């Protein structure tokens, strides 16, 4: 098929050529001799044309291309925004789970391009390409869902899932043999930090400093609140507040943007910008496992 061929070509173009070999070592769809027939020192057009030749010599399909896309996503895992779904209310099996999920998504409207790829730490990665009742599913607007066996949490990349969100949720909860499924308001791009947060897996004596008690108290409070461990890499926060003025409630809306949050916030108190004890709205981001807030009077 030409569609799968151009899909694989686009995925390869997305892959940096410096690691394409690793991709093959992770893809393993093509024989190692075919890999040896291609040198990676030559031009990008030449290498992609040779890869097209290699995949056309074999039988190119959708499952192998989807697996390649999944493994590319694994190696990057930095280009999408992730949200977290919680299931609530004990026997598991991979095969029957896959069968049930596939059956539900086929029953969704008529068809959908679904691909599975088991990963270490029970990380089943699922690539889903949506399609309507009268069109083949589109491979240009995919979505990714990460499931952990026998766990109350799942991860989803929401690029176009706002079209049909309840469908994916109900399919996931029926496949997970769980009744209640909810979406907590927690959204971020560093997927590994989300993993850590959801599971809680994280001299010149002539100078006479004055107010040194204030400095030692503020540094101690900051250390006790944050800790010596490297804080999870979180990148976006937003609070929606509506509280009485006390100085008709004022409605406030703040967004914190930072390439490395929880560290500038860690340095605010030592820099003297904020008080020694920070407000609970900022000291419970890893504690409450909450990223978006709403405050009323």
């Amino acid at each position: 098929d030409e569609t799968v061929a151009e899909f694989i070509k686009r995925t390869i173009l997305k892959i940096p050529m410096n690691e394409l070999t690793t991709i093959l070592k992770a893809w393993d769809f093509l024989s190692e001799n075919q890999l040896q027939t291609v040198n990676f020192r030559q031009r990008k057009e030449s290498v992609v044309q040779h890869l097209i030749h290699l995949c056309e010599e074999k039988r190119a399909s959708i499952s192998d291309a989807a697996l390649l896309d999944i493994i590319y996503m694994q190696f990057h895992q930095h280009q999408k925004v992730w949200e977290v779904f919680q299931m609530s209310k004990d026997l598991f099996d991979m095969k029957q789970f896959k069968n049930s999920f596939k059956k539900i998504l086929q029953r969704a409207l008529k068809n959908v391009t679904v691909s599975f790829r088991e990963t270490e730490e029970n990380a089943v990665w699922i690539r889903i390409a949506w399609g309507t009742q009268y069109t083949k599913p589109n491979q240009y607007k995919p979505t990714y869902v990460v499931y952990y066996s026998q766990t109350p949490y799942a991860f989803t990349s929401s690029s176009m899932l706002r079209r049909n969100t309840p469908l994916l949720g109900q399919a996931l909860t029926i496949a997970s043999k769980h009744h209640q499924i909810v979406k907590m308001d927690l959204r971020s791009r560093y997927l590994d930090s989300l993993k850590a947060i959801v599971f809680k897996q994280y001299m010149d004596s002539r100078i006479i400093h004055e107010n040194i008690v204030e400095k030692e108290r503020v540094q101690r409070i900051t250390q006790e609140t944050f800790g010596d461990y490297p804080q999870p890499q979180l990148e976006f926060a937003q609070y929606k507040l509506e509280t009485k003025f006390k100085s008709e409630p004022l409605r406030c809306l703040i967004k914190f943007s930072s390439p490395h949050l929880l560290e500038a916030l860690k340095s605010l108190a030592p820099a003297g910008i904020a008080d020694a004890p920070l407000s609970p709205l900022l000291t419970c981001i890893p504690n409450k496992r909450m990223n978006y807030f709403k405050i009323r009077d």
Partner: peptide
């Protein structure tokens, strides 16, 4: 109050 109902 942190409104947890949204």
């Amino acid at each position: 109050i942190i409104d947890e109902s949204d």
